[PDB]
Amino acid sequence: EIVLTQSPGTFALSPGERATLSCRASQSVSGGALAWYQQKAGQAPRLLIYGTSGRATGVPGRFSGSGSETDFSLTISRLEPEDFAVYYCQQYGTSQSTFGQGTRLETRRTVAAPSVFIFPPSDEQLKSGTASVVCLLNNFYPREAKVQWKVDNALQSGNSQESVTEQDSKDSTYSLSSTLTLSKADYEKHKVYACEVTHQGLSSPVTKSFNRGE
């Protein structure tokens, strides 16, 4: 099959700036049959560009396409807030159509340190035999952050899961929630529960903790 590789994977720009997204094919795309799509969270993809440089109905002039052979580009001449989304290329020059892996275009802003909160498991949950401990990292930028769970100073690894919100449309920050899961039996055997957070906006890691019972 023809493999499409997009670049960059994820990058950040500000409204007003010019964005250039790239799509490289493993073989030449026949007739320049290369399309670009925009996709926002929860939506179906939206056709922007077809046949390398053709623009779909309803698509603003700030979007343009170029390229030939194996190298193609989507240019957004002057970014608007509505333009921050995921973008996909697609080749349809052969019967076996393929898509690139996607490029996420996010909004650049100044560094913002997370506000950190820790939550003990509820008494209600403890009745069921399982304890969930939750750590919240609120309104930070950039997206990269590290959470380290500690139970009586023992580093926990492999027993937590985390997820991150979409970039906030107003302040362009992210938030992160991490849940540490332990049995009630293990939870009741230990005292100090801590979430240690590392982030570019923090000169040194921040730890929030609680003592079980207190």
Place this chain on the structure above:
Amino acid sequence: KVQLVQSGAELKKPWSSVRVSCKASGGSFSSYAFNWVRQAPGQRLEWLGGIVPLVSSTNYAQRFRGRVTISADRSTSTVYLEMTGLTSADTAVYFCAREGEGWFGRPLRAFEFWGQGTLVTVSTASTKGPSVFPLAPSGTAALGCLVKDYFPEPVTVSWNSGALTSGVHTFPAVLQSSGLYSLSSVVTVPSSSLGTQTYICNVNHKPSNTKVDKKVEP
């Protein structure tokens, strides 16, 4: 205006088959090609195959050849996708898409019109409503709800029946090793409000017809 409307979410056990429909309206049907494209959570778009209803000609992606059948009903302007031998790897949103129209009625080939998508979840897990636990607050305080052990996706969360929107963050669910999902929803509020204001998270899990209103106290 061309509109593609797909059938509702599906839940399947492994080994089983799934049939998804896509009804087209507002334009010519048989002449243009309809395609199916899927997207696993957080992953890329993947083309499955297409059909031109007029001549019933089909074209399938090599990786899915033998597992996928696409058909069309001209009398109802509906196209169908059937996928067999389902495994958890097939959990994805499935989209139907139609080629565009050009000057003098010539087909575009690029996918101009799209359905809303259909979630197909494949798992051994059984439908289960969530347990909702408080994330209790300790100038700004955070509180929330932990929506644990539900299946399948999705769940929605509001606060104070829609009266509280500022500072709300509802996180993407995680899939636990148990095969059940869990998500959290939080809100930041003035610490001074903790003694006076009531906070309730409203959780709706449509797949199990479960609704929960959970008061969160300090």
